[PDB]
Ligand binder design. Structure first.
Ligand SMILES: O=c1[nH]c(=O)c2c([nH]1)n(C[C@@H](O)[C@H](O)[C@H](O)CO)c(=O)n2CCCCCOP(=O)(O)O
Ligand SMILES: O=c1[nH]c(=O)c2c([nH]1)n(C[C@@H](O)[C@H](O)[C@H](O)CO)c(=O)n2CCCCCOP(=O)(O)O
Ligand SMILES: O=c1[nH]c(=O)c2c([nH]1)n(C[C@@H](O)[C@H](O)[C@H](O)CO)c(=O)n2CCCCCOP(=O)(O)O
Ligand SMILES: O=c1[nH]c(=O)c2c([nH]1)n(C[C@@H](O)[C@H](O)[C@H](O)CO)c(=O)n2CCCCCOP(=O)(O)O
Ligand SMILES: O=c1[nH]c(=O)c2c([nH]1)n(C[C@@H](O)[C@H](O)[C@H](O)CO)c(=O)n2CCCCCOP(=O)(O)O
Ligand SMILES: [K+]
Ligand SMILES: [K+]
Ligand SMILES: [K+]
Ligand SMILES: [K+]
Ligand SMILES: [K+]
Ligand SMILES: [K+]
Ligand SMILES: [K+]
Ligand SMILES: [K+]
Ligand SMILES: [K+]
Ligand SMILES: [K+]
Ligand SMILES: [K+]
Ligand SMILES: [K+]
Ligand SMILES: [K+]
Lengths: 147, 146, 147, 147, 147
């Protein structure tokens, strides 16, 4: 079902075409699951995701984090990804809310395109992340108090 | 260990290996006198810690089961980092053992070899469950009585 | 327009020239967005950024961290970068304030120059970090309580 | 003279012979320092050390963590070691108690044996860790409030 | 003017000669900036630094962490350094106190000597760390509440 799940999606715009595709996949999963209505917020980069996810988790049962980090010529990629990983993990446990990871972390643009659910893509990580968010929210709802 | 309240949270990303880890875990629990641990499935390893956190509120030990296998991108690294960070935090926040039965392999062959199937070299799910129960019993004896 | 957001910038001066350039990009973005007078604080090294960002976050809607860490001969680069990543991530979530990462982490000085928005630079990370900080502050203000 | 310090030793039993060796080294140091009866607790694996160290820290002035993690064929070694590192560091600072790391992290068994203070070992990490725990506890006692 | 800053220095004893060189460098800067005799505490290893830095932070405006970690034959170096990085970053933010990092992390003894401010060293890390601690303390004092 999942139609009663309050879902938020925060998507980084850094690689616009790929981020738009991840967002499309997330929104289509939500729509397919009976949510035509998720809260959608855009941020500039992946690093801005956790603070916005933290705000969203106050008013939602699940948050999907979307974005694309692609390795460049420096170590910077490692640190961007470390920040996202540490931040989203903290947000999830602070708020006891699933924060689904649909942030691609690839070595090449081709790899990211192949994982964004564009027409020729092998998979759609934004869609996958949204399923995980919704499933976990439903699971937590059942585990928690009702009587 | 018949009095220990055990939860098992298992990611089903790689379904066959997850089922095998869970079977190992369930068998140990039963042999130890626990026929009815709380068992919860999640979709990916990333989802394990938030669910383990909820389980730790009502249990003496949680076993985390799953399988992460390296692909073509650095993504494997970040998934494993997230699980490590999350489970470590949950165990300390809740003062509850959160046993690690999450395989982190380069290949499917390696994961299979560690999931306690007929020809597997070992059963990580069983190992993690023994770890969880032993630690719960140890904590019970260290703590306040009688 | 960001004319109502309270912006602070904390910049490590370890590599002074590149710091200057990052700070210039940050200030130009802020000014373009209607903020002529952000709070600017200089520190001596990247390691010192988080504790100062922590303080700044008590009195601002967004903090931009600027700096340059360039790899040397030892593993030390890794741990400086780890510290910055861990610290800024913690500060952002503790304070529920965007702490934008304009801290370059490069293998070479050439790479850092190419990312500091000098005349022949490929990009300006200081400008990018400031756009991110401001956009995120504006986003959080709209997400949060208002009537 | 550590005769007044309350020492606990938590030792993982994975690689039992090396564990026994580390524990012997720790017990010998403790007895030399005036402590014939430290609290000794065995756990099955290194991952279990931090939660038990946390419990022990409530009732002791120092905890010595002993065990051995030896690399295998998969990345698993890395994550076990990361967990131990994150966990013991957290416990030490949460409890304001020294948690000495006597957990070996080796590529080979030969390496671990050479560091376990057996008759022909190069060093005795269990002994080292116990010295560190006791010395730090004594130092903290002096820095803290007394007459 | 840094003469009114309360400085603490915690130094590990592992690699005694290099630790002494770092501490000499720190003491010179402290004396050179006209500080009251800093609180100086010795610990056995770098792992023991954060818990003592935590205690010192309760009674000081800044803490300088000094030590030397040199890579050996096993992965152990990585985890010792990770622990230090994690611990010191946490202590600084928990206590809102600069904890300057003068902990060398080198592949060789030669590298560490070259960075320990001896007559023939390229760099003086003890000194650098102490300047960073003092400057950041002064910065925080000005940012914080006063006339
Ligand atoms: O979603 C993203 N995806 C990204 O790929 C990205 C982002 N964001 N940011 C910046 C961003 O995350 C923050 O907005 C910025 O740090 C300010 O906080 C980046 O600098 N990047 C580039 C990251 C990695 C590549 C770097 O290339 P070089 O090593 O510089 O060649
Ligand atoms: O148990 C798992 N095991 C896994 O192996 C796994 C999981 N889960 N998830 C996703 C998952 O953990 C989250 O559900 C998802 O990130 C949404 O939060 C993955 O993306 N993976 C794949 C991880 C690593 C392989 C990646 O392949 P590439 O690098 O993309 O070629
Ligand atoms: O902004 C920076 N950028 C930097 O590149 C930097 C900084 N700061 N600090 C020192 C600084 O971060 C701290 O002030 C210092 O640790 C005291 O706390 C550094 O030691 N560095 C040098 C870092 C990495 C290069 C190291 O060279 P070697 O490996 O020693 O050859
Ligand atoms: O002290 C240890 N020392 C260890 O070496 C160890 C331990 N413990 N555990 C398991 C253990 O830490 C936990 O008990 C378990 O994960 C359940 O929580 C391990 O799985 N190991 C093996 C770790 C690394 C080697 C792995 O080999 P492969 O990569 O699987 O070939
Ligand atoms: O300042 C240090 N500097 C150090 O270099 C150090 C320290 N300390 N400790 C131990 C120490 O940090 C702790 O006292 C110990 O873990 C007990 O808590 C170490 O084991 N080391 C050695 C670390 C790395 C080298 C290891 O050599 P192998 O890999 O064993 O060949
Ligand atoms: K929520
Ligand atoms: K798509
Ligand atoms: K319930
Ligand atoms: K519990
Ligand atoms: K099995
Ligand atoms: K704020
Ligand atoms: K510029
Ligand atoms: K609102
Ligand atoms: K204690
Ligand atoms: K021994
Ligand atoms: K202080
Ligand atoms: K010196
Ligand atoms: K002020």
């Amino acid at each position: 079902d999942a139609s009663g799940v309050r879902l938020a999606i925060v998507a980084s715009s850094w690689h616009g075409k790929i981020c738009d595709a991840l967002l499309d996949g997330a929104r289509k999963v939500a729509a397919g699951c009976g949510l035509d209505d998720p809260t959608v917020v855009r941020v500039l980069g992946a690093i801005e995701i956790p603070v916005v996810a933290q705000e969203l988790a106050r008013n939602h049962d699940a948050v999907v984090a979307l974005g694309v980090v692609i390795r460049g010529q420096t170590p910077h990629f490692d640190y961007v990804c470390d920040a996202v990983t540490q931040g989203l993990t903290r947000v999830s446990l602070d708020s006891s809310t699933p924060i689904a990871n649909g942030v691609l972390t690839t070595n090449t643009e081709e790899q990211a395109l192949d994982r964004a659910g564009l027409p020729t893509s092998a998979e759609d990580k934004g869609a996958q992340a949204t399923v995980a968010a919704l499933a976990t929210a439903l699971t937590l709802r059942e585990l928690r108090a009702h009587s």
